[PDB]
């Protein structure tokens, strides 16, 4: 393959396009990039471990990888207190070393390995038009992804369990013994409205559902892997889709955009797979906590919070949701769908229960509400916490904010990339990606519009 | 041949005065729905309890608004992010009072504009064009989605979506500045660069082309008649325009390749708008503009003010007055 | 609403006068 514009037709700033038909060089690029990913995982973990104060909560210290390890049940115990710092260190080290290996292999393939793989092996050689080989690679990778899902399942069941923020007696690392294989629940999650109070799959609120859904995902992915190894695309798929390297790239870009959007929403709303113990409160959690904090304080002062009407005539502390449930008053009325382990002991069948509010509120709940209210995911770009009109002395930005913002931005730009590559793949397949041919300009053979 | 094939040939026909296309089969119904509802609501909708405190806000012309003050008011804070279609209201009057028109209009509008972008791709494909006009269009679409969908999602309520009105837009902007300091957010700075620069480059390109027009007319008729639709000959002298501009600044700062010039004209505002859309979308998660309040201290430790502190004073003034009856607790978190 | 008493006539003329200017010029074009 050429390495300049005259012999490839691509400028330097589009130089990776030169790799489209150099399968060995492309494999080298992919393996080296995978090395970059694993390297960042390891290096960032080591950095976070080095910059970790293990008695100050994770979310106060700008940590996004350590919470992922904690949620998996490594190095943490009840309420998420960091027991052993060594598992975080081991995860980081293992990623760093394997990153070295991946980088070496990617460099070998990109710089010295065979340029193309098709005349060296039929197994690893591929052609973008080879629908059977493309589906074979889909199948191998589907099997691998099913294995990874079952790895999560095995960690939750037989290898110490996962962190359950909903654990009775307090959130804790627990072993999931009864994952829900019941397909009704698992796949009705996917049918829930993506709107308030339903929260399509963002609303999964128990480790049993998460682990059972992962068992289902493992089975689906493995069966799809076998299905795609042993079959070729059907006629309908062959007629509807573009079959080219850039087309497959565009399809994956669309997929990635969808996943990035979903993850940003997931981290913003879900406090089960993202326990607030490690990721801090959600915005909804913080608003509810403020309402709870002042309910408790004014009640201790003697306010009859059941009957106190605010300035507008709605209840200051308590009101009804549009469906009748008893909810916190104020602007946090918008957040009445919130559920968190510190608030549910006060919820009755009708919503918030006056009897529990008056004689069941525990000091740990008061402490938790204060903490969550003061760690609301609000902050400046230079990491000044609180509402934007506050002064510089509180250095905090929620990890949920960092993750949600970054993943929304990445999702959008990958949607843009999908549009770019899908349009280009179509135009190249139809043969006009390089401009209108003057001889056969299609519009010139078209009748005038009016 | 078949009825379905004939229908397909019709929808994808490049001979229709307005291209329909498969994306058009979604665009047209949703956009017409949004338009009809918008016109009806802007003219005649009753007041909407936007803040969920039973303090309805009059948006329509018949309830005392002019064109500048009129709006389709966002749905109630009591609704939050809940889906509120007409059939979930006990009555049409209830649906109107809680701001159902806003949700109907916004959801249909957003579907329509995404289908518009798809339709741009589709027609370029049918005409044998290159496919990326829709990519440029993805910048305004991104901004619209940020202000009508992403920001309400991050904030937890469609009540916090931009109102569908002129003064409502201004209200949205002022409160947004009070809560997020968007002016001090670099992505908004990039958006401003995008629009200021886009206007600069529009003026520059238009003026250089107009300046270098080849003489084909007389001083009486419009010089516009010098260009005939569908000529290949160039209607202006790009080399003379390059001579002028490379002498105005210096030679190597002036484009002489029209293709690179037009790529730059496309790319600059589009990238700026993408960045400002992403700025709004990330302030949706309350990652706000820079906060330099009390950054400069004297040696004793007293704060020395800067223009950032003056801006913060303005922000506080906006913040303490906004939604004056909606807040019960000391921190505006929701 | 208690609006400015000249509002309707000002709006009508503001629109109508240039409208009729354009209409005249357009219609006579080609004469």
């Amino acid at each position: 393959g050429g390495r300049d514009l005259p012999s490839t037709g691509f400028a330097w700033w589009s130089g990776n396009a030169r790799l489209i038909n150099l399968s060995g060089k492309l494999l080298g690029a992919h393996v080296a990039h995978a090395g970059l990913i694993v390297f960042w995982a390891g290096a960032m973990t080591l950095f976070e471990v080095a910059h970790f104060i293990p008695e100050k909560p994770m979310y106060e210290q700008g940590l996004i990888l350590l919470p992922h390890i904690a949620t998996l049940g490594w190095g943490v115990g009840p309420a998420g207190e960091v027991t052993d710092i060594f598992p975080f260190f081991v995860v980081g080290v293992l990623h760093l070393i394997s990153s070295a290996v991946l980088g070496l292999g990617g460099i070998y393939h990109a710089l010295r390995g065979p340029e193309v793989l098709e005349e060296y092996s039929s197994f690893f050689g591929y052609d973008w038009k080879d629908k059977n080989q493309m589906t074979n690679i889909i199948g191998y990778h589907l099997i691998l992804l099913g294995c990874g899902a079952l790895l999560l399942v095995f960690k939750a069941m037989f290898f110490g369990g996962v962190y359950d923020t909903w654990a009775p007696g307090g959130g804790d690392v627990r072993v999931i013994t009864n994952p829900t294989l019941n397909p009704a629940i698992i796949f009705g999650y996917l049918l829930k409205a993506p709107f308030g109070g339903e929260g399509w799959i963002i609303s999964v609120n128990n480790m049993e559902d998460i682990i059972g859904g992962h068992i289902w995902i493992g089975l689906i992915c493995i069966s799809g892997g076998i299905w795609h190894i042993l079959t070729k695309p059907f006629g309908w798929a062959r007629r509807a889709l573009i079959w080219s390297g850039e087309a497959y790239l565009s399809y994956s870009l669309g997929a990635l955009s969808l996943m990035g959007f979903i993850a940003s929403v997931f981290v913003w709303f879900n406090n089960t797979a993202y326990p607030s113990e490690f990721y801090g409160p959600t915005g909804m959690e913080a608003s509810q906590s403020q309402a709870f904090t002042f309910l408790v304080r004014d009640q201790r002062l003697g306010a009859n919070i059941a009957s106190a009407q605010g300035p507008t005539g709605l209840g200051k502390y308590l009101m009804r949701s549009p469906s009748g449930e008893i909810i916190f008053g104020g602007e946090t009325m918008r957040f009445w769908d919130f559920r968190g382990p510190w608030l549910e002991p006060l919820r009755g069948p009708n919503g918030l229960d006056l009897d529990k509010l008056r004689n069941d509120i525990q000091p740990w709940q008061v402490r938790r509400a204060a903490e969550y209210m003061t760690h609301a995911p609000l902050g400046s770009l230079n990491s000044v916490g609180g509402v934007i009109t506050d002064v510089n002395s509180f250095n905090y930005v929620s990890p949920r904010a960092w993750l949600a913002t970054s993943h929304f931005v990445l999702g959008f730009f990958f949607l843009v990339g999908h549009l770019w590559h899908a349009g280009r793949a179509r135009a190249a397949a139809a043969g006009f990606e390089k401009g209108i041919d003057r001889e056969t300009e299609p519009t010139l053979f078209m009748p005038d519009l009016d | 041949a078949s009825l379905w094939e004939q229908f397909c040939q019709w929808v994808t026909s490049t001979n229709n005065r307005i291209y329909v296309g498969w994306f058009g089969t979604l665009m047209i119904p949703t956009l017409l729905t949004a338009t009809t509802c918008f016109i009806i609501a802007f003219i005649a909708a009753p007041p909407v309890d936007i803040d969920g405190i039973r303090e309805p806000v009059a948006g329509s012309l018949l309830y005392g608004n002019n064109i500048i003050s009129g709006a389709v008011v966002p749905s109630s804070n009591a609704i939050g992010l809940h889906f509120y279609p007409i059939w979930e209201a006990a009555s049409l009057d209830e649906w109107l009072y809680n701001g159902g028109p806003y949700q109907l209009v916004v959801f249909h509008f957003l579907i329509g504009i995404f289908c518009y972008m798809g339709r741009q791709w589709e027609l370029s494909y049918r005409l044998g064009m290159r496919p990326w006009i829709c990519v440029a269009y993805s910048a305004p679409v991104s901004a619209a989605t940020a202000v009508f969908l992403i920001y309400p999602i991050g904030q937890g309520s469609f009540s916090d979506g931009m109102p569908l009105g002129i003064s409502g837009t201004f209200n949205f902007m002022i409160v947004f500045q009070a809560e997020h300091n968007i002016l001090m957010h670099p992505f908004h700075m990039l958006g401003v660069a995008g629009v200021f620069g886009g206007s600069l480059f529009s003026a520059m390109h238009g003026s250089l082309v107009t300046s270098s027009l080849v003489r084909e007319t007389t001083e009486v008729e419009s010089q516009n008649y010098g260009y005939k639709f569908g000529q290949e000959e160039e209607t202006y002298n790009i080399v003379a325009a390059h001579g002028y501009f490379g002498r105005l600044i210096f030679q190597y700062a002036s484009f002489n390749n029209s293709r690179s010039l037009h790529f730059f004209l496309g790319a600059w505002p589009v990238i700026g708008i993408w960045f400002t859309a992403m700025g709004v979308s990330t302030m949706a998660f309350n990652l706000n503009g820079f906060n330099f309040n009390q950054s400069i201290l004297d040696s004793q430790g007293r704060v020395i003010g800067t223009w950032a502190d003056v801006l913060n004073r303005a922000n506080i003034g906006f913040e303490v007055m906004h939604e004056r009856n909606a807040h019960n607790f000391p921190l505006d978190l929701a | 609403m208690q609006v400015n008493n000249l509002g309707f006539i000002a709006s009508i003329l503001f629109v109508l006068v240039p409208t009729v200017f354009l209409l005249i010029l357009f219609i006579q074009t080609g004469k």
Binding site: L449 | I43, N66, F229 | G7, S11
Partner: peptide, 30 residues
């Protein structure tokens, strides 16, 4: 009654749109 004036100007603008689209000058190649 100012509402009538607002509706009038809005309708004028929309009608202009419809005519500018439906009854436009055809672009012709010659």
């Amino acid at each position: 009654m100012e509402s009538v004036a607002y509706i009038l100007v809005l309708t004028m603008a929309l009608a202009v749109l419809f005519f500018a689209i439906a009854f436009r000058e055809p672009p012709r190649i010659e």
